[PDB]
Amino acid sequence: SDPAHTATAPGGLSAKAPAMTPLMLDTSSRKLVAWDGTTDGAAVGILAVAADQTSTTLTFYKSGTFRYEDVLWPEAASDETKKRTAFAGTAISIV
Amino acid sequence: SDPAHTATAPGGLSAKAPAMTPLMLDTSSRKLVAWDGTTDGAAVGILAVAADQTSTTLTFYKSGTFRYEDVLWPEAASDETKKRTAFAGTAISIV
Amino acid sequence: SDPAHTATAPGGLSAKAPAMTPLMLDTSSRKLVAWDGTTDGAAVGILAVAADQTSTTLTFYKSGTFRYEDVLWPEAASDETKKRTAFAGTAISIV
């Protein structure tokens, strides 16, 4: 049914991040960074391999269905519905 | 070919919506609602399972290729081109 | 591996475009046109069949993984990172 395809892109993480972390683009450099949890519609992917500020390239999921309880959401994303639709319009969804 | 993958998310419809209805996010709650046909780029999916105002979860297509004539476009979407590219950037397209 | 799915949409090119040309929506007509290389986040597809200003329909990739070296980026897209994440959030990625 729904394949979880991976992808790679330049990383600009501020700190170490585990797999299952939502990612967004930095608006200035357009590197992948952790989603802030507060910018609506900014999530673009889910980190697939743990990484940090030294990681030049990140490996991330660009498709699939992920359980709500399995994604390591940022604490600032305090609303369950906005998390559940954080990937709407991408090939990623939340169950 | 181009399988049509489904997804689920919280719903906030105000009226009955048959399958094949384009959906957008509500800008306040970020629940899935009917695409208004007037906010450019806001369509995120196509309802897969008929639903209504009591539906708490909507089941929607997040990929696939759909015939222009089969999608139940909102009437306020009066321009054919803008309908045909309403899903550009998503995994959905119109033929 | 990650299938590259095609799509069709109304085209609005003003010049010849070979296959592998990044595409964006025209913000007035919402026809598919060449990505300018400067509007951040506007790339929505990669042309799959060469086209020109006479083409009424463009045939494009809406998913897949493409090599950075194979995509025919516009000259104005001068920053490698911004090209590499030009499709983030779509079903397309760059390797």
Angle at A14 between CA A10 and CA A15, to 5 degrees: 110
Of A23, A17, A11, the residue nearest A56 (C-alpha): A11
Q: Does B84 touch chain C (CB under 8 A)?
A: yes
Q: Answer left, alpha or beta for residue A28, where phi above 0 means left and psi between -120 and 50 means alpha.
A: alpha
Of C3, C1, C4, C2, the residue nearest C49 (C-alpha): C4
Q: What are phi and psi of A84, to 5 degrees?
A: -60, -30
Strand partners, C32: C11, C25
User: Resolution in angstroms for this experimental structure?
Assistant: 1.1
Please name each of the domains of chain B with its CATH number: 1-95 (2.40.300.10)
**CA pair distance C95, C93, nearest whole angstrom:** 7
First to last CA, chain C: 13
Chain A interface, mutation test: which of C35, C39, C81, most A Cβ atoms within 10 Å? C81
Experimental method: X-ray
Which amino acid is located at A86 in the chain?
Answer: A
Which amino acid is located at B18 in the chain?
Answer: P
Is residue B35 within 8 Å of residue B42, measured between CB atoms? yes
**CA pair distance C53, C43, nearest whole angstrom:** 19
Helices (H), chain B: 80-84
Of C2, C81, C90, the CB nearest to A30: C81
Strand partners, B94: B66
First to last CA, chain A: 14
**CA pair distance B69, B92, nearest whole angstrom:** 15
CA dihedral of C3, C39, C29, B70, whole degrees rounded to 10: 30
